[PDB]
Design a protein around this nucleic acid. Sequence first.
DNA 1: GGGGTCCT
DNA 2: AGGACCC
Length: 380
Amino acid sequence: SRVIVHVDLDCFYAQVEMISNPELKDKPLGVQQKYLVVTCNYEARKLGVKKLMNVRDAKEKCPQLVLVNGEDLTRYREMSYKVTELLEEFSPVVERLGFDENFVDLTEMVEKRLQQLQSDELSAVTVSGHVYNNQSINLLDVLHIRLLVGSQIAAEMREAMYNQLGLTGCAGVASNKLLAKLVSGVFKPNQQTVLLPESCQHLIHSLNHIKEIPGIGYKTAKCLEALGINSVRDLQTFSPKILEKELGISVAQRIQKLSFGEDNSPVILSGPPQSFSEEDSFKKCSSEVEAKNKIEELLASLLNRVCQDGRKPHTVRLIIRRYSGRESRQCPIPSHVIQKLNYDVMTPMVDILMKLFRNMVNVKMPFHLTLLSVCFCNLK
DNA sequence: GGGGTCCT
DNA sequence: AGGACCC
Ligand SMILES: Nc1ccn([C@H]2C[C@H](O)[C@@H](COP(=O)(O)OP(=O)(O)OP(=O)(O)O)O2)c(=O)n1
Ligand SMILES: [Mg+2]
Ligand SMILES: [Mg+2]
């Protein structure tokens, strides 16, 4: 009974970079974070570059590959919010998934448009983009009609994103979030597809690995494989009783429904972010003098972002990762420090973070850190 | 990697 | 505070 759209930008970081430096939009491009090419444009994907590939492999598999540094997410994050604000203008319930994916619940919009339709141009209702599995449309099936109106709205969304933000992307229209996300990637890049209900099982069985189901991640998949469960059909067919006692009642029941293409989870309004964090990874930090400097660097960056936002963070968290898996310490922020917008907030904040740091790290005995992160949360 | 979410 | 998920 729902019409959901999943919007997925084409090679997002690379797209932002190509727009920033149009001298790049004609060469194979890779966006680099440390030793990783986290994403690349479709010209590089032709030359055999894949997501999250090593720069050694990349530089060898494509020596003409242009690399730009994408460790600072500032510009990506800003464009990311322009996209979801644009979608929110179509319909206010927009759920973000990472920086480059959004779900919108179109069912009220679709119903409104259909109520405005007369007899002449309901003939007449046509699909925009691809129909998954090339299945024939039945114009007398109200479910088909509602999903086709969905595809028209999705086309308007992609058109607005291009005309207003210069961005291309894909869309998937289906009856729930799981299916919309699975179907959006069927034709890429810069294309869209709609899933009609009688093709649901074809879509779910098209998957080759159980980890390809959104909601089934690394740990869960490893567990399932441990159990002899490898195909979607294996999971569909496994004993609920055993699954429940192996993974617990909540996860087992949820993921088994997913394996049938069933997902009743609502599209949630993401709204403003609930946390701001910054991190830096490194080979080695083994002193407190370094720690403090790193933390000060991160803290400075964060205060720029708190300042921009408006709301104020009421707790701080320090996160670490030691050599050879993360640990954290948090505490409320003193009320007087919370009012800064002018003064000197650095020293009192670094004082707090260093205490947390010494709480976790025993500095009287040697240590080896490989990541540091500062997070502001509990915003008001 | 450099983010972000929610539940236990 | 830690674990699991998503990108
Ligand atoms: N461990 C990971 C996995 C993902 N990413 C980033 C790179 C991508 O920009 C985005 C997730 O990748 P997508 O699946 O959205 O793929 P892209 O948007 O990069 O390209 P496309 O959608 O065309 O496949 O988040 C990341 O930072 N770290
Ligand atoms: Mg994308
Ligand atoms: Mg998965």
